[PDB]
Design a protein around this ligand. Structure first.
Ligand SMILES: *[C@@H]1O[C@H](CO)[C@@H](O[C@@H]2O[C@H](CO)[C@@H](O)[C@H](O)[C@H]2NC(C)=O)[C@H](O)[C@H]1NC(C)=O
Ligand SMILES: *[C@@H]1O[C@H](CO)[C@@H](O[C@@H]2O[C@H](CO)[C@@H](O)[C@H](O)[C@H]2NC(C)=O)[C@H](O)[C@H]1NC(C)=O
Ligand SMILES: CCC1=C[C@@H]2[C@H](C1)C[C@]2(CN)CC(=O)O
Ligand SMILES: *[C@@H]1O[C@H](CO)[C@@H](O)[C@H](O)[C@H]1NC(C)=O
Ligand SMILES: *[C@@H]1O[C@H](CO)[C@@H](O)[C@H](O)[C@H]1NC(C)=O
Ligand SMILES: *[C@@H]1O[C@H](CO)[C@@H](O)[C@H](O)[C@H]1NC(C)=O
Ligand SMILES: *[C@@H]1O[C@H](CO)[C@@H](O)[C@H](O)[C@H]1NC(C)=O
Ligand SMILES: *[C@@H]1O[C@H](CO)[C@@H](O)[C@H](O)[C@H]1NC(C)=O
Ligand SMILES: *[C@@H]1O[C@H](CO)[C@@H](O)[C@H](O)[C@H]1NC(C)=O
Ligand SMILES: *[C@@H]1O[C@H](CO)[C@@H](O)[C@H](O)[C@H]1NC(C)=O
Length: 917
C-alpha cells in the first residue's frame, strides 16, 4: 500500500494508455472527419415529436375505425339472418355442408399457402370450430350451423374491400366459432371453449365489483372442499383485469382469506396471491350467513377505494344453508344493486329451497355444480344474466370494446381484438315476446396484430434510444421495446416496463387520461442487457386518441431531435468475395423491400440483398429511404476501413476492430476476427450501441462467463465510443466504433506492489456494474468477465454501503424459468467523485483499500490487501435474473397506481324479467 499519490500516478498512466489505445485503434476522429467532410450527400431533418405523435394517433384511429366498421356490418347481418330463421328439425333431406376443422383432412379444401398467414389457408370456404364435448348431429347445434352459414358472404366482402384484415370470428352461446380464411386447426387434447375466452367474456357483460363469499364450515371439508377450491379458482380465471374482487370465508364470522380487506384490481399478481390463499383454506366451524353478507355489503359500500362504480354483485359458494338473512336483504337494498349468485358445489342432502329462494329473490341466478365436469361449463352463465341490462339498452349498449395484448390461439403472435354482442333482434316493430331476447346469441370479433400497429410506427427514422409506447386507461402498455411474450394475456404496467420515477408517476397520474403535453426530465435509463444503467435526460410527448380510450407517447433524448437522411441519389462493397479487403459485412434484416424476406442466416440474406439491388432506383413498390440510408452508410464504413484500418494490418494488443451504424452495416477488418462475431446484425437491437449513445466516455463491455463459444481469451475485451457530429450547430450521434483488447497483452502490460504468484495484496479493475476485467492473482483472470461480488463480496458490500455504487432492482414478470419473477439488479456510479479510501473491518483483522476511477472511462481501479490475511465472506453477491417473489402484494394495494374506468356501465335495468328461479 504505497501511497495515494502513487495510486494517482498508476491510475493516470493506465487511463492515458487505455484511452490513447482505444482512440487510435478506433478512429472516432477519422469517422467524424469523414461525416463532416462529406456533409453534402445527406440532409439533417427535424423530428417534430408533437407532429409525429399526432400522425401516429390519427393512423391508429383510422385502422381501429376500419375494424369497427367491419365488425358492425357482420353483427348487423347476423342479426337479420337469425331474425329470419325458420328453425327446421329434419335435416336428412338437406345434408348440411360445412368445413369442420380438426377432422381427418363437408368440404375437401385446397389449402393454398399465402403470406402474412404462416399456415395453409382457404378463401372460398369458412371453417367451423366445435369443442369436443359438444355433440354434433343434434338439431340444437345444426340450427346454428344453418343460420350462421350466411355469414361467409359478409366475411368475403370484408376481406375484399379491405385486404389487410387478419381474422374475423363469430362465437355463439352454443359453442360454434366460424372464422373466415379457413385453416386446419392447429392441433395436429384441448380444453378450448369459445365462451371461456377473454375476448368473449369482455363483450358478454359489463365490468363488475364482484365478491366471493365461500362457505368454510366443517361440513364442506374433503371432496367438496377441493371442488369448491377449483370452482373459485376457475371463477377468478373467468374474471378479467378490469374487475374487482375479494374472497371471504365466513366461519362464525366473516374473516378475510387474504391480506387485502377491500376490493383490488384483480390483476395477475392479486389473482395468484388469492389462488394461494384459497389453496390454503382450513374449514372448521359452523355457518353464520348474517355476518358474511353484512361484511360483504360494507365492503361493497366503501366508496373510498379505487373502483369502477359499476355492476356490483356477490357470489355465494355454499353446500347447505337455511338462514334467510332477510334483515340484510329486505331493508338495506332499496337501491337493489346486489345480485346474489348462489351456487351449490358438490353433493348434499340439505334443502335447496332457501338457496334457490335467495338466488331468485336477490336479482341473481342459481347454479348446481355436481362434479369437476360442470365447473368448466356451469361457471360462465352469470355473464348471460349480467347481460340483461345490456340487451335491454340495445343500440346504446352496442359498442366496440378492444382487449389487451395476448397470445393468439393459432400462432400469429400478439394481437388485440374487438367485440360486439349479438341478440335476438326478432320482431321489435311489434315487440311480441321479448322473453328470450334477454339471452345473448353470442359475440363476434376481428383481430389486429401488433405487427400491423408497429407498421404505423416508423422506428428507423430516429436513434435507437428513441421509441414509441402506448398505454390504456388501466395503465398497461400496448407497444413497448421491453414488451416480449414468454411462450395468459401479456400484462406489463408502464412503471413496471420502464424505470420508476416520481416524474413518470406524475405524468401518468396527471396528463395521460385525455390530456396533451410535453415534459423534459432527467431519469435513469436501463440498458438492453440486464447489466447496466445510465443517467440521462429525455422529453416525453403524449396525446389522447379520440377514437379509442388508448393513449400514445413518444420518447426522444436530446440528441435525436434531428435525424439524417440521404440527399436524393458503393453497392459492390457489400460483396462476400470482397470481404478480405472490405471487412466481414453484416446487414440488418430490415424490411428493405417487399419482394425479399427475413433471412436471419444473414449470408444468403446479404447475397439476396445485393442481388435485388443489382436487379435500379426505379423501386415501384420498394422502400427507398431505408435503401438510401443503408447504401450511404455502407459507403462511409467502407471508406473508413479502406483509409484507416487497412494501413495497420495487425496490432499486438488489438485483436479485432468494428463499427455499427444507423442503417444496419457492421464490419470487422479480418474475416477470421469476423467469424467469432456473436452479436446480431440489427444495429437497433445490440446493447453496446445504445450504451455508447447514452454514455459520453469509452464504455468497456465485459465478456460473459461460463458460456458455450470461445469469448474470453480468443475474442478479448470490447470497447466502444459513439461518434458526435455538428453540421449547423446541433448534436447528432450516428455510429459507434470499438476494438478487441488482447487479454494476454493486457495481463503482461498490467504486470508493469502488484506482483502475481502471491497472496498479500490484490490489484483489481472493475466497471459500471462490478464486472471483472483485469487481475494479477492468476485465479481471478481465468474467471474473467464475472461479477466482482461473486468472487469478493466483502469489498463489494463495503463499496455499496460507502456509496461509490448504487443499485436498482427491477421486476420482470414476463420471463421463462425452470409466472416467473426476476429480480434484475443493475449497479452504477452515483457520486461524481474519483477518490475513495478507508479501512474495512471483518472483526479480528483489518484491510486497507484505495479505489480511484479512471477518467474518460467507466472503469475503476481498486487496490486492497489479499483475503488470505482476512477470511471474510458474510454472504455472496450474485447479479442475475433472480428467482424471487416481490414486491409484497399485500402492501401495494394500500397505495395502488392511479387508474381510470369506463363511464358506460349497464346495471339495474328498470324492466328486467328475472321470473325464472
Ligand atoms: C332466440 O333464438 C332461439 C334460437 O337460438 C329461438 O329458439 C326457438 O324459437 C322458435 C321460434 O321462436 C321455437 O319454435 C323453438 O322451439 C325455440 N327453441 C327452443 C329450444 O325452444 C328463439 O325463438 C329466439 N327468439 C325469438 C323471439 O325468435
Ligand atoms: C502497453 O503499454 C504501453 C505504454 O506503457 C503502450 O505503448 C504505446 O503503444 C502505442 C500504440 O499502441 C504507441 O503509439 C505508443 O508510442 C506506445 N508508448 C509507449 C511508451 O510504449 C502499449 O500500447 C500498451 N499495450 C497494450 C496491449 O495495451
Ligand atoms: C376459435 C376460432 C377463432 C377465434 C378467433 C381466431 C379464430 C382464434 C381467435 C382470434 N385470436 C380467438 C382466439 O384467439 O381464441
Ligand atoms: C381503411 O379503409 C379505407 C377505406 O375502406 C382504406 O382506404 C384503407 O386502406 C383502410 N386501411 C387503413 C389503415 O386506413
Ligand atoms: C336450413 O335448412 C333447410 C333444410 O333443412 C334449408 O332449406 C334452408 O335453406 C337452410 N337455411 C339457409 C341455407 O339459410
Ligand atoms: C437535461 O435536460 C434538462 C432540461 O432540458 C436540463 O436542465 C439538464 O441540464 C440536461 N442535462 C444535462 C446533462 O445538462
Ligand atoms: C381529439 O382530442 C384532442 C385532444 O384535446 C382535441 O383537441 C381534438 O379537438 C379532438 N378531436 C376530435 C375530432 O374529437
Ligand atoms: C447459413 O447459410 C449458409 C449458406 O451458404 C449455410 O452454409 C449455413 O449452414 C447456414 N447456417 C445455418 C446456421 O443454418
Ligand atoms: C460452469 O458451467 C458448468 C456447466 O454449465 C458447471 O458445471 C460449473 O459449475 C460452472 N462453473 C462456474 C464457476 O460457474
Ligand atoms: C433507484 O436508483 C435511484 C437513483 O439513485 C434511487 O434514488 C432509488 O431509490 C433506487 N431504487 C431502488 C428500487 O433501488
Amino acid at each position: 500500500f504505497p501511497s495515494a499519490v502513487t495510486i494517482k500516478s498508476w491510475v493516470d498512466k493506465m487511463q492515458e494508455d487505455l484511452v490513447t489505445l482505444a482512440k487510435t485503434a478506433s478512429g472516432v476522429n477519422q469517422l467524424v472527419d469523414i461525416y463532416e467532410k462529406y456533409q453534402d450527400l445527406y440532409t439533417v431533418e427535424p423530428n417534430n415529436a408533437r407532429q409525429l405523435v399526432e400522425i401516429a394517433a390519427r393512423d391508429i384511429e383510422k385502422l381501429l375505425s376500419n375494424r369497427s366498421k367491419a365488425l358492425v356490418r357482420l353483427a348487423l347481418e347476423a342479426e337479420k339472418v337469425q331474425a329470419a330463421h325458420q328453425w327446421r328439425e329434419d335435416f336428412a333431406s338437406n345434408e348440411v355442408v360445412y368445413y369442420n376443422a380438426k377432422d381427418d383432412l363437408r368440404i375437401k379444401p385446397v389449402f393454398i399457402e399465402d403470406a402474412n398467414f404462416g399456415r395453409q389457408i382457404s378463401y372460398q370456404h369458412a371453417a367451423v370450430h366445435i369443442p369436443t364435448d359438444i355433440y354434433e348431429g343434434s338439431t340444437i347445434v345444426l340450427n346454428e350451423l344453418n343460420w350462421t352459414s350466411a355469414l361467409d358472404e359478409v366475411f368475403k366482402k370484408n376481406r375484399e374491400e379491405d385486404p389487410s384484415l387478419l381474422w374475423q370470428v363469430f362465437g355463439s352461446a352454443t359453442g360454434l366459432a366460424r372464422y373466415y380464411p379457413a385453416s386446419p386447426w392447429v392441433d395436429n387434447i384441448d380444453l378450448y371453449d369459445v365462451r371461456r375466452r377473454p375476448w368473449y367474456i369482455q363483450g358478454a357483460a359489463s365490468p363488475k365489483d364482484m365478491l366471493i363469499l365461500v362457505d368454510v364450515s366443517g361440513s364442506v371439508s374433503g371432496l367438496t372442499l377441493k371442488l369448491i377450491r377449483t370452482s373459485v379458482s376457475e371463477m377468478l380465471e373467468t374474471l378479467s383485469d378490469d374487475d374487482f374482487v375479494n374472497v371471504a370465508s365466513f366461519n362464525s364470522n366473516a374473516q378475510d382469506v387474504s391480506c387485502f380487506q377491500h376490493l383490488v384490481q384483480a390483476n395477475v399478481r392479486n389473482k395468484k396471491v388469492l389462488k394461494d390463499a384459497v389453496n390454503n383454506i382450513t374449514a372448521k366451524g359452523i355457518t353464520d350467513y348474517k355476518k358474511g353478507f353484512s361484511f360483504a355489503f360494507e365492503q361493497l359500500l366503501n366508496y373510498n377505494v379505487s373502483r369502477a362504480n359499476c355492476n356490483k354483485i356477490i357470489m355465494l359458494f355454499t353446500d347447505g344453508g337455511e338462514e334467510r338473512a332477510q334483515e340484510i336483504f329486505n331493508k338495506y337494498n332499496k337501491d337493489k344493486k346486489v345480485r346474489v349468485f348462489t351456487f351449490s358445489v358438490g353433493q348434499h342432502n340439505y334443502d335447496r329451497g332457501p338457496i334457490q329462494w335467495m338466488a331468485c329473490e336477490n336479482k341473481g341466478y342459481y347454479y348446481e355444480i355436481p362434479s369437476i365436469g360442470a365447473i368448466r361449463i356451469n361457471t360462465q352463465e352469470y355473464l348471460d344474466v349480467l347481460g340483461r341490462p345490456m340487451v335491454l339498452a340495445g343500440d346504446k349498449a352496442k359498442q366496440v370494446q378492444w382487449t389487451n395484448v395476448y397470445l393468439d390461439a393459432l400462432e400469429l403472435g400478439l394481437v388485440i381484438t374487438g367485440t360486439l354482442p349479438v341478440f335476438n333482434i326478432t320482431g321489435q316493430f311489434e315487440n311480441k315476446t321479448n322473453l328470450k331476447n334477454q339471452l345473448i346469441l353470442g359475440v363476434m370479433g376481428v383481430d389486429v396484430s401488433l405487427e400491423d400497429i408497429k407498421r404505423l410506427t416508423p422506428r428507423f427514422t430516429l436513434c435507437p434510444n428513441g421509441y414509441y409506447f402506448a398505454i390504456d386507461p388501466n395503465g398497461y402498455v400496448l407497444l413497448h421495446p421491453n414488451l416480449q411474450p414468454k411462450n395468459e394475456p401479456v400484462t406489463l404496467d408502464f412503471l413496471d416496463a420502464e424505470l420508476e420515477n416520481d416524474i413518470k408517476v406524475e405524468i401518468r397520474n396527471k396528463m395521460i387520461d385525455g390530456e396533451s403535453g410535453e415534459k423534459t426530465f432527467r431519469t435513469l435509463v436501463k440498458s438492453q442487457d440486464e447489466r447496466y444503467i445510465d443517467k440521462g435526460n429525455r422529453t416525453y410527448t403524449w396525446t389522447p386518441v379520440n377514437g379509442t380510450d388508448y393513449s400514445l407517447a413518444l420518447v426522444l433524448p436530446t440528441y435525436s431531435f434531428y435525424y439524417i437522411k440521404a440527399k436524393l441519389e458503393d453497392s459492390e462493397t457489400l460483396k462476400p468475395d470482397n470481404f478480405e479487403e472490405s471487412g466481414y459485412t453484416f446487414i440488418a434484416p430490415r424490411d428493405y423491400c417487399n419482394d425479399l424476406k427475413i433471412s436471419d442466416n444473414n449470408t444468403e440474406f446479404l447475397l439476396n440483398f445485393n442481388e435485388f439491388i443489382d436487379r435500379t432506383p426505379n423501386n415501384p413498390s420498394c422502400n427507398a429511404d431505408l435503401i438510401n440510408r443503408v447504401l450511404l452508410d455502407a459507403g462511409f464504413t467502407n471508406e473508413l476501413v479502406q483509409n484507416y484500418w487497412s494501413k495497420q494490418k495487425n496490432i499486438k494488443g488489438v485483436k479485432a476492430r468494428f463499427v455499427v451504424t444507423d442503417g444496419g452495416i457492421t464490419r470487422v477488418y479480418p474475416k477470421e476476427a469476423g467469424e467469432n462475431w456473436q452479436e446480431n446484425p440489427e444495429t437497433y437491437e445490440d446493447s453496446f450501441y445504445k450504451r455508447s449513445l447514452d454514455n459520453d466516455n469509452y464504455v468497456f463491455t465485459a465478456p460473459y462467463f461460463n458460456k458455450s463459444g470461445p469469448g474470453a481469451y480468443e475474442s478479448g475485451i470490447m470497447v466502444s465510443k459513439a461518434v458526435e457530429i455538428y453540421i449547423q450547430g446541433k448534436l447528432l450521434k450516428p455510429a459507434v466504433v470499438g476494438i478487441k483488447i488482447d487479454v494476454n497483452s493486457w495481463i503482461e502490460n498490467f504486470t508493469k506492489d502488484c506482483k502475481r504468484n502471491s497472496d498479500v495484496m490484490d490489484c483489481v479493475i472493475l466497471d459500471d456494474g462490478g464486472f471483472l476485467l483485469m487481475a494479477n492473482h492468476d485465479d481471478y483472470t481465468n474467471q474473467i468477465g464475472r461479477f466482482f461480488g461473486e468472487i469478493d463480496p466483502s469489498l463489494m458490500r463495503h463499496l455499496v454501503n460507502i456509496s461509490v455504487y448504487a443499485f436498482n432492482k427491477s421486476y420482470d414478470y414476463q420471463s421463462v424459468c425452470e409466472s416467473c419473477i426476476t429480480e434484475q439488479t443493475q449497479y452504477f456510479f452515483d457520486n461524481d467523485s474519483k477518490s475513495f479510501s478507508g479501512v474495512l473491518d471483518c472483526g479480528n483483522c483489518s484491510r486497507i483499500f484505495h479505489g480511484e476511477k479512471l477518467m474518460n472511462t467507466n472503469l475503476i481501479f481498486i487496490m486492497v490487501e489479499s483475503k488470505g490475511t482476512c477470511p471474510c465472506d458474510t454472504r455472496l453477491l450474485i447479479q442475475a435474473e433472480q428467482t424471487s417473489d416481490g414486491p409484497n402484494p399485500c402492501d401495494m394495494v394500500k397505495q395502488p397506481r392511479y387508474r381510470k374506468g369506463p363511464d358506460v356501465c349497464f346495471d339495474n335495468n328498470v324492466l328486467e324479467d328475472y321470473t325464472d328461479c
